[PDB]
């Protein structure tokens, strides 16, 4: 009588800087996506999300204490006893992953890790925790980061981001050229990112007035995370839902009627103008379904100087496919061919380069011959592969499997074997047996290093 495997799941993401205070007795509004912003319909209150991922900062509770509160809260809402997938804490930064009991046998390869940011003085409370796992055929990653505080420290926040994405060891370790920004079908990155509204301190009361009027436009135009992202300084190739809720920091505790922005000994004589510190971003592989269903803040949880933030997503997932052939052999009906491909690189290096193709649809990664270096008009390096690239042999040829897969590409130096650029190509093509354009930007350490473009021709069993 087996339940069919899902094609889509819903995921709840929560971030809350708890301000080193215990929570109030009731926090269900958080998990219901109720308050300000893009909120969830009342008619969905009893429908459980498939996965709940809860990130805290300045969390004063034990793992045991917080798990008990979380599981009781979800049982009250849904009448379901959720299973603990993973819990990991670095200092007072914590991530909890809970899942419906029906998903226990769909989840495998659970990993946790942390990154400590800063050196000496700036090492010891900021960094990130994360969790990854497989959900049937779909790889999921989750990062909760508490970045450097202070309105004048946006560059340090951007440096913290680059250290976390380089050093957090999640996902398939065989994907050696790839950082967490390429290892997952869906990656969610959330936390107290600590970016501020960059307006003069003497405009504090003006800002509060704007908030009371629910007029966020002239504040969001100065939000450091939106401006740094627009300038490609941080979170390149991530998405965020439009913000339609009030700044979530810095509140007087025990009400939400008052923003506490003035400099005090307790703040290091820093101002904390109202800001959207608490954020949820994501990055999914090309042409995979991901839709943000909610993004908002609670109004009734007041123990911290931050309000909790929620976001919910409908995310596409795939099945664990088994044919008569693969896994454990190739299906010769299938092939992936790359035609007239070239990489354009920002590097000044004059080494030869080769490609590596990594995918779950291959028995193991494939290494190309070296390309032929030319100079582009505007000074650049162009690495030409012609029709020289290997024919990739997928393990399963069924189009219902193969059209849902992705090929990770690394371009590596022949001299050093180091990646100069990583990217991802979807096989969700408009046509099979047809030459079609392909394209990915290439990044390294999450910054743009080039592009890969050319044509693909996909052979399936149909």
Residues forming contacts to ligand YBP in the complex (CB under 6 A) are 109, 111, 132-134, 139, 170-173
Please state the closest distance from residue 356 (CB atom) to ligand YBP, in A.
17
Candidates 305, 18, 256, 267; CA nearest to 151 is: 267
CB of 97 to ligand YBP, least distance (A): 12
Smallest distance from the beta carbon of 214 to ligand YBP, in angstroms?
40
DSSP-derived secondary structure for 225-285? HHHHHHTTSSSTT-B-PPP-S---B-BPTT-SS-B--S--GGGTS----SB--EEEEEEE-
Query: Cα separation of 456 and 359, whole Å?
Result: 15
- Cβ proximity to ligand YBP: between 111 and 330 the closer is 111
**Quick check: 157 and 192 in contact, CB under 8 A?**
no
Task: Tell me how far apart the alpha carbons of residues 457 and 461 are, in angstroms, rounded to a whole number.
Answer: 14
Taking only Cα atoms into account, the Rg of the chain, rounded to an integer number of angstroms, comes to 23
**Would you say 108 or 215 has its CB closer to ligand YBP?**
108
Of 59 and 356, the one with the shorter C-beta distance to ligand YBP is 356
| 3-state SS assignment for residue 375 | strand
CB of 109 to ligand YBP, least distance (A): 4
Nearest CB to ligand YBP, comparing residues 64 and 174: 174
Closest residue to ligand YBP: CB criterion: 111
Minimum CB distance to ligand YBP, residue 84 (Å): 17
For residue 360, the minimal CB distance to ligand YBP (Å) is 7
3-state DSSP helix/strand/coil percent for the chain, to nearest 5? 15, 35, 45
Question: Rounded to 5 degrees, what angle do the CA atoms 67, 70, 72 make?
Answer: 105
As measured in angstroms, the least distance from the Cβ of 353 to ligand YBP is 27
Nearer to ligand YBP, 127 or 296 (CB): 127
DSSP codes of every residue in 184-207? -SEEEEEEE----B-S-GGGHHHH
Reported for 365-372, long-range contacts at CB under 8 A and 24+ positions apart, including other chains, are 365/174, 366/390, 366/392, 370/414, 371/342, 371/343
CB atoms within 10 A of CB 208: 16
Closest CA to 111 of 128, 94, 92, 87: 87
Contact present, 326 and 376 (Cβ < 8 Å):
no
Nearer to ligand YBP, 174 or 265 (CB): 174
Q: Which is nearer to ligand YBP, 110 or 155 (CB)?
A: 110
The span from the CA of 301 to the CA of 299, in Å, is 6
C-beta of residue 252 within 8 angstroms of C-beta of residue 260: yes
* Residue 149 or 410 having the CB closest to ligand YBP: 410
What is the spatial distance between Cα 62 and Cα 98, in angstroms, rounded to a whole number?
Answer: 17
Q: Smallest distance from the beta carbon of 145 to ligand YBP, in angstroms?
A: 18
Residue 45 has what DSSP assignment? T
Q: Taking the complex as a whole, how short is the minimal distance between the CB of residue 336 and ligand YBP, in angstroms?
A: 20
User: Which residue's CB is nearer to ligand YBP, number 109 or number 391?
Assistant: 109
Alpha-carbon span 401 to 408, nearest angstrom:
17
Closest listed residue to residue 54, CA positions, set 266, 294, 280, 258: 280
Find the shortest distance in angstroms from Cβ 281 to ligand YBP: 19
Identity of the residue, 107 or 273, whose beta carbon is nearer to ligand YBP in the bound complex: 107
């Amino acid at each position: 009588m087996e339940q069919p495997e899902p094609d889509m799941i819903t995921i709840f993401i929560g971030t809350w800087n708890m301000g080193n205070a215990p929570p109030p007795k009731k926090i269900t509004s958080w998990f219901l996506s109720k308050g300000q912003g893009k909120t969830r319909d009342d008619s969905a209150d009893y429908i459980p999300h498939d996965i709940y991922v809860i990130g805290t900062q300045e969390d004063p509770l034990s793992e045991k204490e917080w798990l008990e509160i979380l599981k009781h809260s979800l049982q009250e809402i849904t009448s379901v006893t959720f299973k603990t997938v993973a819990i990991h804490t670095l200092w007072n930064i914590r991530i909890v992953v809970l899942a419906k009991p029906e998903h226990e046998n769909r989840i495998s390869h659970i990993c946790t890790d942390n990154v400590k940011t800063g050196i000496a003085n700036t090492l010891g409370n900021k960094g990130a925790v994360g969790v990854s796992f497989m959900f049937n055929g779909t790889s999921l990653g989750f990062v909760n980061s508490h970045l450097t505080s202070g309105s004048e420290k946006k560059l340090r926040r951007n440096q913290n981001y680059m250290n976390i994405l380089r050093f957090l060891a999640l996902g398939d370790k065989k994907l050696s050229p790839f950082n967490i920004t390429h290892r997952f079908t869906h990656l969610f990155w959330f936390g107290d990112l600590n970016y501020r509204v960059d307006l003069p301190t003497w405009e504090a009361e003006t800002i509060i007035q704007k908030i009371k009027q629910q007029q966020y436009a002239d504040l969001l135009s100065h939000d450091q995370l939106l401006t740094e992202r627009r300038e490609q300084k941080v979170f390149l190739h991530f998405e965020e839902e439009e913000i339609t809720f009030a700044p979530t920091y810095r509140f007087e505790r025990l009400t939400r009627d008052k923003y506490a922005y003035t400099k005090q000994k307790a703040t290091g004589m820093k101002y904390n103008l109202p800001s959207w510190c608490d954020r949820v971003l994501w990055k999914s592989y090309p042409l995979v379904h991901v839709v943000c269903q909610s993004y908002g803040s609670t109004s009734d949880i007041m123990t911290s100087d931050h309000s909790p933030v929620f976001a919910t997503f409908e995310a596409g997932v795939t099945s664990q496919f088994v044919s008569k052939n693969g896994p454990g052999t190739v299906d010769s009906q299938g092939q992936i061919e790359f035609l007239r491909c070239y990489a354009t690189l920002k590097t000044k290096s004059q080494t030869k380069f080769y490609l590596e193709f990594h995918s779950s649809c291959l028995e193991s990664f494939v290494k190309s011959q070296e390309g032929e270096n030319e100079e582009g008009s505007e000074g650049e390096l162009v690495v030409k592969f012609g029709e020289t690239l290997p024919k990739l042999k997928p393990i399963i040829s069924d189009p219902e499997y193969l059209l849902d897969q992705h090929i990770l590409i690394s371009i590596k130096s022949s001299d050093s074997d180091e990646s100069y650029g990583e990217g991802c190509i979807a096989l969700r093509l408009e046509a099979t047996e047809t030459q079609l354009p392909i394209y990915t930007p290439l990044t390294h350490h999450g910054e743009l290093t080039g592009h890969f473009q050319g044509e693909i021709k996909l052979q399936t069993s149909q």
